Amino acid sequence: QVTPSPDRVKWDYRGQRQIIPLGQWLPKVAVDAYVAPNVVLAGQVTVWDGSSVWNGAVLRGDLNKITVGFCSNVQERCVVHAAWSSPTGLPAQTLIDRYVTVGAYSLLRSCTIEPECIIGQHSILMEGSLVETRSILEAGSVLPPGRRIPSGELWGGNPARFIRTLTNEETLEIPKLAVAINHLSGDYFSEFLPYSTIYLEVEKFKKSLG
Amino acid sequence: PDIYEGSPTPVTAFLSIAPKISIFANILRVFIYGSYGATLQQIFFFCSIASMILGALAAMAQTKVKRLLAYSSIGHVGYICIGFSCGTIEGIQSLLIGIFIYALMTMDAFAIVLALRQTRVKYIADLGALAKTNPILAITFSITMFSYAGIPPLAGFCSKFYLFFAALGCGAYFLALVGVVTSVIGCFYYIRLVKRMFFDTPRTWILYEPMDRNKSLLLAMTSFFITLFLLYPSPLFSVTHQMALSLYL
Amino acid sequence: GTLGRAFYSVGFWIRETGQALDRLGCRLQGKNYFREQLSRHRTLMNVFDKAPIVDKEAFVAPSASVIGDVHIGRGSSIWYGCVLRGDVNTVSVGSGTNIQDNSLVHVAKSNLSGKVHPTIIGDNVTIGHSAVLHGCTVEDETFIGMGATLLDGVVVEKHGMVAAGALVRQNTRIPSGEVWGGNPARFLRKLTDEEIAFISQSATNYSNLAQAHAAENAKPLNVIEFEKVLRKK
Amino acid sequence: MGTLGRAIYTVGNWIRGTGQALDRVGSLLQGSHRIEEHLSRHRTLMNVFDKSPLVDKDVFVAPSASVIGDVQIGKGSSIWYGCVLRGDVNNISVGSGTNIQDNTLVHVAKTNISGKVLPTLIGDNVTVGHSAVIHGCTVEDDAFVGMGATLLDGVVVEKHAMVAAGSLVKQNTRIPSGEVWGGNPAKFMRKLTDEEIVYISQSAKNYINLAQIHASENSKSFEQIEVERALRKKYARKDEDYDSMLGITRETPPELILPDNVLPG
Amino acid sequence: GSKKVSDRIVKLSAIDPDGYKQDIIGLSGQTLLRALTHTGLIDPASHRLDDIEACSAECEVQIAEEWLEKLPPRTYDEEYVLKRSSRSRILNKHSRLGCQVVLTQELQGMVVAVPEAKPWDIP
Amino acid sequence: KVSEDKNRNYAVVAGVVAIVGSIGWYLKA
């Protein structure tokens, strides 16, 4: 039987809280990091200096730690999660290292991305998978559990396969892309004062109700 | 060095400055105002040379920040005691100027160290990539190091200038040679920190938590003083000449 | 321009100061309600002067994100969870076009990989659930299958179809009347006339469904729910 | 209280008026370009066509989720952040102990191109991974749908069957019991080991436990949020040596302790 | 996927200061210290870089000579750090700095003894 | 209508006294 509750909230005037603490696990956001207003950060999430998390992304650290490194970006509608353990037996936290560009609509679960990597749009990185430094995944790639992307290589496909070895110029371009995305995120960061004025609207909405 | 490293860092910062001021006041008023004479100035002369040499070499050996600063302070008290040794009004004035400038520089350095202790800074190598993760902090710390090295026109240049002024004023050329050598050694181990923050590309970075308002304001003021003191140094010069004279009149 | 940005920046200084003054006034009266964590999501968001222009007859779900210079035509619909970001370049949506739930229509964030292409969506276009459109052109009366990804430089010609879950690589042109699918997307077959009829009728149905949902969302916020949330213990 | 209290309150009123005037002047200086933030208009549960969602008492529905129209959700189920369940032209039914992960879309069709158009039926103890798309299909009990998978109209996922992460399951495809399918288009990969069946069950119960802590946090009032913010700040660090000098033992308050069933051990 | 993390995994055993043997995991190309920090056998906070200039022998391990022949010989700096960090200022012939040992496939099955942790957190 | 926190009100008075007394101190010196 489906027995509902009369008191369940249908419309919450506050909207979805961006920062969801879980016991003592409080998401940590650097003062110079951009987090879009509708992003959800829950539990053991750390967002470091210069990084950015864009509209519609969800970072849920309720089974393990989630880290977004220096000057890295998690783009629109990405979901980043983690598990208690990985099939490889290595620790199962999700580590996004520095100068990493995670393309929009990407799904990450208990994966490690070494510094200076680009994840193509609409990609999937599964439990215990590893992307070595200075590597690129094409859009739409699927990396199964415990699979590895060797350093200095371009991969792609469902499932991902070796395409070609990257040139040094290409690998030099990766931190530049991360820096450029941080520069763009600065413009969004400058649109928000430290406080919103919504509380005034709440005040008058209350007063109109007595 | 052992006490400075093992004590809590705020204790280390406090011990690095205030007791020197108090004890140098005592030394001035006891010896300078009293009278056995050339023997005691020779005491401080030999101890100054030993302190400069040992401080330079031992600091060059250090891999940890606190120990480096401790040995740096030992070398600088050698530089300062050269002024007491020469036994002139300008010697006392230069000693006071050195104490004041060293105190302000030490306050700057320990404000940075205390800011970095929030992420448990211990080794010089822990500063790697600081010019990337906090550019204005890496520049501020670099100004402090270059001031410690005595590079003009930073405030630290006064102590070097007087060291050589007294070497050619009291008539001491071994002292000048020692000053040249130890100054070059000091510059090397001070610019090693700048190299670590600006030139190195380590595989693992340490990201530091931003400092509180108190330390940022103190750092901002001490950094303007260190860069701009030589543009308007008259009040310190006049007040230190006043004090040197007041010891006997 | 530059003067506009200078005044926009100075304006923020004055505003920051005024809001701080208001918080001081509230603190003197013993109120902490300004501490409440309330969502700062804006359905339409400007980036300086780049602001969304939305037709009055277009449905935009409140949870959707429209950022920067984005044009939405009459009878078009932006569904729940959609994200449209035109900042480095523009995004335009024609009349009678549905952008389905959780879809993403955006442009290149940086010009590092070359000049940033705009995203052009024509009239009576269907964009399926959770599709990704990145700096591409989608002509009138075409069908983009849900979960499909279209990269920059792609052109979907009129009555073209992109099958669900397809990955259309950069600069690919999809000819008219053709069904392309797979990763990478390749020619599968020709479109049948019944499929064209379904394209048009599904678009007209979506415009009516949009109307219904816009009327639903436009209803006044219930005060009983507000009082229930306020009086929780 | 008293005359001093009243005077300070009046001065606060003056300061508030001045601050809001300064904010208006600053807005004018910006050329009025800044779209103002407003009260949230998102409705977690919404009617359409006079259809109301039927949600059981103990269901976690994230505030950012969208449950619209003719949707039924059974006991112990959970709808996570950013999920959209749009039951507007047809029915959506979710069984008991079933988790619909973050950013998932579930939808239905009024009339399919060919065949009998069917509602979207998700059974009991089903895991649906992050950012999946479920469209007009049937997922039977104890089935698993991988993250980012797409199920088209008429698809049937049978009991104890798996759809791999990233798969595109074409219309009317049937995933038989005990098999795992994947790819684009989805096709048979291999049989499911017994350990993987146990995994699927474990997934479902772990989610049931996770839903509890998330539901508890998302339903807290302003006052409790403030109380727990202060408590979290107080107990974030420690000086046990000074406590031993004082002869006291600080204990973590129970509102900061998670239940054991969600802890890694 | 023709390239797995399992291709780089190195099977290892560590004996804790209490004497109990534990089976641990590390990647080839990474240091023994990282493998030891995965399960907390050595506190990661005590040795955050893999550099000899940031080492006070917090990574120190004892290895029997059968596995010592399969490692490169200790450098002068390594022996300096080990000797000065010794309480008795004596160089242990089976001591290695864990941060200077890079794991390889040839070290599969190596047994390592982790001594009691030295103080490391300077006030 | 009224601020009820007595200690807060006293602190407000103290801050006001500090500000006004500082102004007077500058003015009469």
Ligand SMILES: CCCC(=O)SCCNC(=O)CCNC(=O)[C@H](O)C(C)(C)COP(=O)(O)OP(=O)(O)OC[C@H]1O[C@@H](n2cnc3c(N)ncnc32)[C@H](O)[C@@H]1OP(=O)(O)O
């Ligand atoms: C506590 C939380 C519980 C939850 O809710 S988990 C939900 C979030 N996570 C997921 O959805 C990920 C589910 N896992 C998957 O989808 C895995 O890919 C799946 C189906 C288990 C297969 O993984 P494995 O068993 O490790 O792969 P395998 O050993 O059978 O390899 C056989 C060949 O198939 C290929 N492959 C496997 N994974 C794939 C995929 N998803 N898609 C497509 N292709 C795949 C793989 O390349 C492999 O080798 P080859 O292709 O023959 O050369």
Ligand SMILES: CCCCCCCCCCCCCCCCCC(=O)O[C@@H](COC(=O)CCCCCCCCCCCCCCC)COP(=O)(O)OCC[N+](C)(C)C
């Ligand atoms: C000639 C002297 C002898 C030689 C010594 C030279 C020592 C320096 C070495 C030179 C080599 C190159 C040095 C490069 C440094 C330049 C870059 C720099 O410092 O930029 C800073 C700028 O650092 C400063 O803040 C400097 C401020 C000093 C103020 C001195 C000016 C005093 C009067 C000015 C009045 C205010 C401005 C008037 C106009 C608006 C930016 O810091 P970030 O860490 O990147 O970001 C800061 C954060 N945020 C931008 C968001 C605020």
Ligand SMILES: CCCCCCCCCCCCCCCCCC(=O)O[C@@H](COC(=O)CCCCCCCCCCCCCCC)COP(=O)(O)OCC[N+](C)(C)C
């Ligand atoms: C209509 C025209 C009149 C417009 C007047 C505008 C004048 C405003 C000028 C700005 C003054 C800035 C003063 C900065 C100090 C901030 C004072 C403050 O924050 O008030 C606090 C604390 O107040 C104090 O403790 C002493 C300072 C108050 C004295 C200055 C008040 C400024 C307005 C004067 C109001 C009193 C006038 C009438 C007195 C009978 C209230 O108590 P708490 O909420 O418990 O404090 C929490 C901690 N925190 C400081 C972070 C907020």
Ligand SMILES: CCCCCCCCCCCCCCCCCCCC(=O)O[C@H](COC(=O)CCCCCCCCCCCCCC)COP(=O)(O)OCCN
């Ligand atoms: C000479 C070269 C050129 C120098 C130029 C000097 C120019 C004058 C300086 C201008 C200052 C500009 C900034 C003024 C506005 C800042 C006002 C501070 C507001 C304040 O209340 O700060 C509080 C903290 O106290 C503090 O942070 C203040 C204390 C910080 C240390 C300042 C010195 C105090 C001791 C004196 C040392 C002298 C050393 C000499 C050897 C609370 O701050 P919060 O609300 O953000 O919360 C902090 C979390 N707990």
Ligand SMILES: COC1=C(OC)C(=O)C(C/C=C(\C)CC/C=C(\C)CC/C=C(/C)CC/C=C(\C)CCC=C(C)C)=C(C)C1=O
């Ligand atoms: C590398 O080879 C070796 C040495 O050789 C450097 C040694 O020594 C020793 C052992 C013997 C030692 C250390 C005796 C030396 C101790 C002394 C002189 C006590 C004084 C302490 C210090 C720190 C010296 C400071 C004094 C100075 C610089 C001069 C005194 C003051 C003035 C002139 C004013 C050993 C084992 C050794 O293997």
Ligand SMILES: [Fe+3]
């Ligand atoms: Fe080491």
Ligand SMILES: [Zn+2]
């Ligand atoms: Zn649909």
